[PDB]
Design a protein around this nucleic acid. Structure first.
Ligand SMILES: [Zn+2]
Lengths: 87, 50, 70, 206, 119, 135, 50, 126
RNA sequence: AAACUUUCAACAACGGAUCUCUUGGUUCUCGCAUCGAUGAAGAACGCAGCGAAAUGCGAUACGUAAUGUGAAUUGCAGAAUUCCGUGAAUCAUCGAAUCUUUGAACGCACAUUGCGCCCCUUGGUAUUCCAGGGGGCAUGCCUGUUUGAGCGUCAUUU
RNA sequence: CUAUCUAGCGAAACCACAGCCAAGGGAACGGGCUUGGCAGAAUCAGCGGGGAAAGAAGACCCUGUUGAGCUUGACUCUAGU
RNA sequence: CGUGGAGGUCAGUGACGAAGCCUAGACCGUAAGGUCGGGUCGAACGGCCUCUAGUGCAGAUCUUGGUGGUAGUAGCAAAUAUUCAAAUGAGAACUUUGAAGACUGAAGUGGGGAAAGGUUCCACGUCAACAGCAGUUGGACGUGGGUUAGUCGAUCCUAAGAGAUGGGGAAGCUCCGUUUCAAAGGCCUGAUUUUAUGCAGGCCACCAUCGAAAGGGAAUCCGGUUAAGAUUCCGGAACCUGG
RNA sequence: AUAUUGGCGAGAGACCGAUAGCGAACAAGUACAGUGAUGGAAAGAUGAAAAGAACUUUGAAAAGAGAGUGAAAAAGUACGU
């Protein structure tokens, strides 16, 4: 019984989609995420998991904001606007 | 294991030493830096002596 | 189109963020027509379609091809 | 230092009719099941991975280095050696070849080249020019694409334009006598550089 | 082609207001046409004119606010600089510059002297 | 004392490590004192602290903190050093006067192990220095 | 499921719009390598995992 | 020999840089040498090719052909000439792609900004 | 004697070795100090005339403003004349904006596109009910403002 | 109903090289070696004598200065009390 | 003897053909090997003196890939069963229509749902692959269409239990605790009609929140309609809730 | 003055040359597996240029045979050797 016929009973979910990271890793009864650790304010990660870290660190996404910071620094966090010569 | 008629060495490498090796490839670089710094300190030091 | 020809209904893709009030209002103003009820559903491609039936003072087919489709 | 080891693989141990190399676990992909770490393994760590802490530089006693450079200088005055090293001095007045200290002061390639030519070096200069070749190996793609012979070595005592003047004629190099390099006097460890000395340089020698 | 930022910057709050609603109607119609014509590129040029206007209407309002706050101690966080979370917290130059009174005296009576060796 | 927070006294290992009960925290109570009020007033900076009372169950400290964004401190010389981002949570890195103590920071033969910073000094004496021309 | 949450249906809709062959004109683009939609999916070959 | 600590003699970065050059530097790379006639007129060796320039082919099987540039097909590093084409088996025409380093310019499309560039280059004047 | 088997060769298969390539890796060295409640890193769903991805973006959605450059883009369609010009561009630069649903994540929740409270404003007869538009309500802490508590405690009205 | 024969479809195990015996000697039970018997293409269905056939570096036994589960007035400790 | 790379040298070989590969063709060497011809090929390569190593395979139940004999072999035999004709098609044991023969036998091989899937639903086109024969057929391929609610659910309630907060432990990640050793609110409306508003009355409160698509619970029915939706659209007839 | 397998900008190598070099030279932390933590590949090369084979003929078609392009088809998007 312990294999094939018992596999047919598999139709409830232990985890759903996590609001925070979007994997199907959000444990319904514990109401927490096995990957990212939501709803804890900190984000789950471990030093024994270099790969998992690499899978999710900064730069693996869009860097909507951050990606623009060093150009900004390169020009001294300028305020104002550019002049226009003429010819 | 101990064999032959040799001196008794005490090479202390029982320890993960490979995680702390410092090979000074920067020997030449740091020198060029040290000088470029000595140069420009003296520069802004007006005619003072360093 | 058949809904226009036979049911006095204008059919629209409409903001996902809309609602039967917000839709009726916009239809009522963009097209200067009166509205009987709005049904809506969320199409399986992720857009919202709105069945807007006009009151009997209006003929949707008329106002369909005023807007300029057929 | 990580290569070959970015896996949680394990031996299956014996009993599975299959070598006991560690194998990558899980499934659903081609790589689950496969030999891991370990130097007969596609994708595993190499044997005795190369380390930076290899000894690169070698020390040589200063007195001996000198001895070497000395010998190499003596050798540039022996025609038969200079010839065997492939310098084309089969003509040329005498040897050591010495040249007025006006050379130190030339400013312009064209005039430097004309100067060298007159003093007998046309032929060696050509050699280099007719010797440019695409490097045989694979270093061709490691910033070492071309190969050419070695021209004359001009030594001076003061630099008033001869260095920049000559820095673009294929094969030729310039040197202050005050310094003077074994890698230049005996290239490939072969004795007998074709050397052109300015007077100035020549008397500075002792 | 469509609108140009500069031609728009000369107009009133309320002309741009109407400009928009016409541009809106514009695209409103083209969508009806996009769907019986086998491709309608004219639309991207009006989709953008819309952006241009909104941009410029918005430029106007910000200046407005910026003006009726000129010289004032508290500006909206909106229109403050931005720089960086850190740099924003750093001492002002004044604050940093602050030297205790005992130090003031010392600095005034014993500064680094210029000098040069030889005789 | 610090009770070794292991499940039933169970230690899983060699006997030298099997202790649960005569075990002592390397940092002092006063440091635990500083560190908690510091977490509570995280907008403040911990300057110092001093003992004021104890019973069998508790030691009591008054902690001194300073407000780094109040203009009386930012304008004061003398103290505005504490506004610098490097003195963020000094009591959590053991830079308050209690921290420097427990941390073994003093001049002399009795502080060899410990005082350029223990961990840092270890790292130094366990580093294999290799020159280009090997000595 | 039938009574399905909006989040799920949303994901379902996106998952359906992605379910098409490669647009043939991409193949005509200059320096184009993409020959076919290699990330393509089927309800009877691979589940969505929600 | 390079001398600058800011230029790289590196084969790799050179190739990357050419192959990923954006339209604007690609303009500069697709420059062409003026004819001798044109070279004496403005005291200048070459210019970034442009559309509506007249041109001679001085290399390769189309040598000697002449014509107007129809487009500078930057994303291809190539230039096409209103008049230099292949006729297919099915009678269809199709542009030939030419590199401007293999052309010589015979009539510049002058233009206020074009002139200014010639001046900026140490070109004649008028 | 075929057929069959085996050996060798030619041509043809199978398979991807070899050689040559290399916008990648790897190691050294030099220069620099800049994430986040002014909402980061990270997640989700969207945005193109014609796109599934990668890349880029946020309902202003493969981008808006600005500055330089000075004619492209290009698979096809298409523009537009703007090509002696405040001006092409899937260009560079970037100082002005936009920046959905989220996330330390902040009204409460969140296997829910679930459920409140407050100010302004617009409709439906409306301070109270409904709907639309805009702006708000986390926690610890500091300095200060206001309003308070305790025979903790002072002085007084009489 | 299979097996069987046909069209279509089409795996796996295993494989040093192979495949007829008697005796001999031989790592003391040979397909090969030595001496003899012999020995004729290509094959089909069956079969279970042999291939000391095939399936997991022997379950039993011993060795190893190799373990683990378990017990106890072995050794050394320990939460607790 | 032979290999990757390095310094030197033959001003070495090469698109008039480098390297590589194939060849019961030739020659040198005891051998490791070297050399040549012919064929194929297309961009680089070699000799000599040195330098340097990630430097030479038959084996490791070696690693990765590729290939055989086995073999057109084992097999493609559970679940009673098929047959005639026409149509269509390049093609029909297998598609569609007709006829026959049978089966599931309402404890169904009927009609709906819950979990789960996620478009598999419907239409048009359509067969390379897939459906271990076939295919014109399909849950497949391509292109489209499609899910309509005050009344059906969620939503509200509370259950086992989960869990913020005053706090107490803990070096700390956090652990305990849920009315708990806490100053824990907000409901009416007068006053005031400077006003819709601050206030004057006043009672009541050991009291977060999450947790049921089968528990509790406000309210809809019949007819008609689509390729595919229907207690949701249409027609008609009602009811509940707030105002 | 010291540290620096992270971040930004650079110059290099007697390093590796697609089973090598990072796991990834490619729509690679992708496809795929697993309830989950995690595990995690394969995969580069027509030609200078698509000139990517008009047209004829056989075939239901895929294709074949001619023709044609090309320096070469002993390069045919199954593509260098
Ligand atoms: Zn998560």
């Amino acid at each position: 019984g312990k294999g094939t016929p018992s596999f047919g009973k598999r139709h409830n979910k232990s985890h759903t989609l996590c609001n925070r990271c979007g994997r199907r890793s959000f444990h319904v009864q514990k109401k927490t995420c096995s990957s990212c650790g939501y709803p804890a304010a900190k984000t789950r990660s471990y030093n024994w998991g270099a790969k998992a870290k690499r899978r999710h660190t900064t730069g693996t996404g869009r860097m909507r904001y951050l990606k623009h910071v060093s150009r900004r620094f390169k020009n001294g966090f300028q305020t104002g606007s550019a002049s226009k010569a003429s010819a | 294991a101990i064999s032959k008629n040799l001196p008794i060495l005490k090479n202390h490498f029982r320890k993960h030493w490979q995680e702390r090796v410092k090979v000074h490839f920067d020997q030449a670089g740091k020198k060029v830096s040290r000088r470029n710094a000595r140069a420009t300190r003296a520069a802004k030091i007006a005619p003072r002596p360093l | 189109m058949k809904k226009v020809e036979d049911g006095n209904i204008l059919v629209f893709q409409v903001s996902m963020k809309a609602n039967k009030y917000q839709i009726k209002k916009a239809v009522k103003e963009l097209y200067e027509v009166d509205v009987l009820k709005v049904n809506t559903l969320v199409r399986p491609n992720g857009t919202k379609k709105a069945y807007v039936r006009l009151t009997a003072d209006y003929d949707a087919l008329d106002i369909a091809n005023r807007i300029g489709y057929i | 230092e990580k290569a070959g080891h970015q896996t949680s693989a394990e031996s299956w141990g014996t009993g599975r009719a299959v070598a006991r190399i560690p194998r990558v676990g899980g499934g659903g992909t081609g790589r689950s099941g496969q030999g891991a770490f370990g130097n007969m393994c596609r994708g595993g760590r190499m044997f005795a991975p190369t380390k930076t802490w290899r000894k690169w530089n070698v020390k040589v006693n200063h007195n001996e280095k000198r001895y070497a450079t000395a010998s190499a200088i003596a050798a540039t005055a022996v025609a038969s050696l200079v010839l065997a090293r492939g310098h084309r001095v089969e003509k040329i007045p005498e040897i050591p070849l010495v040249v007025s200290t006006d050379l130190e002061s030339i400013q312009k390639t064209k005039e430097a080249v004309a100067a060298l030519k007159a003093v007998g070096a046309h032929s060696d200069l050509l050699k280099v020019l007719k010797s440019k070749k695409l490097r045989a190996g694979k270093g061709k793609y490691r910033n070492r694409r071309w190969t050419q012979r070695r021209g004359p070595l001009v030594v001076y005592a003061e630099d008033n334009g001869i260095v920049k003047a000559l820095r673009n004629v294929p094969g030729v190099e310039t040197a202050n006598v005050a310094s003077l390099n074994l890698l230049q006097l005996a290239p490939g460890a072969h004795l007998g550089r074709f050397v052109i000395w300015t007077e100035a340089a020549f008397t500075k020698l002792d | 082609a469509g609108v140009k930022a500069y031609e728009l910057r000369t107009k009133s709050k309320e002309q741009l207001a109407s400009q928009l609603v016409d541009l809106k109607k514009e695209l409103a119609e083209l969508k009806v046409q996009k769907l019986s014509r086998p491709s309608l590129p004219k639309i991207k040029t009006v989709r953008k004119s819309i952006a241009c206007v909104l941009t410029v209407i918005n430029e106007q309002q910000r200046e407005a606010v910026r003006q009726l706050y000129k010289g004032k101690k508290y500006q909206p966080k909106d229109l403050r600089a931005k720089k960086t979370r850190a740099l924003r917290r750093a001492l002002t130059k004044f604050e940093a510059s602050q030297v205790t009174e005992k130090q003031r005296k010392k600095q005034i009576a014993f500064p680094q002297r210029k000098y040069a060796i030889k005789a | 004392n610090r009770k070794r927070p292991v499940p039933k006294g169970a230690t899983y290992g060699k006997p030298t490590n099997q202790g649960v009960n005569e075990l002592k925290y390397q940092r002092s109570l006063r440091a635990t004192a500083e560190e908690r009020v510091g977490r509570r007033a995280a907008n403040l900076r911990v300057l110092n602290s001093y003992w004021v009372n104890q019973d069998s169950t508790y030691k009591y400290f008054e902690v001194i903190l300073v407000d780094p964004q109040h203009k009386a401190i930012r304008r004061d010389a003398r103290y505005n050093w504490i506004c610098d981002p490097v003195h963020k949570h000094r009591e959590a890195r053991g830079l308050t006067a209690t921290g420097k103590k427990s941390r073994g920071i003093n001049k002399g033969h009795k502080f060899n192990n410990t005082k350029a910073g223990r961990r840092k000094t270890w790292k130094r004496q366990n580093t294999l220095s290799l020159w280009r021309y090997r000595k | 499921a039938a009574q399905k949450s909006f989040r799920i249906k949303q994901k379902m809709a996106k998952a359906k719009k992605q379910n098409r062959p490669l647009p043939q004109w991409i193949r005509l683009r200059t320096n184009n390598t993409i020959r076919y939609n290699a990330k393509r999916r089927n309800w009877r070959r691979t589940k969505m995992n929600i | 020999a390079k001398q600058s600590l800011d230029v790289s003699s590196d084969r790799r970065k050179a190739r990357k840089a050419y192959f990923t050059a954006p339209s604007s530097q690609r303009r500069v790379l697709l420059s062409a040498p003026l004819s001798k006639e044109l070279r004496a007129q403005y005291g200048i060796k070459a210019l970034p090719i442009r559309r509506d320039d007249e041109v001679l082919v001085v290399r390769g099987s189309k040598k000697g052909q002449e014509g107007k540039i129809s487009s500078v097909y930057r994303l291809k590093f190539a230039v096409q000439v209103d008049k230099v084409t292949k006729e297919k088996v099915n009678g269809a025409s199709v542009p030939i792609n030419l590199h401007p380093s293999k052309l010589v310019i015979t009539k510049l499309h002058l233009d206020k900004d074009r002139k200014a560039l010639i001046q900026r280059k140490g070109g004649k004047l008028e």
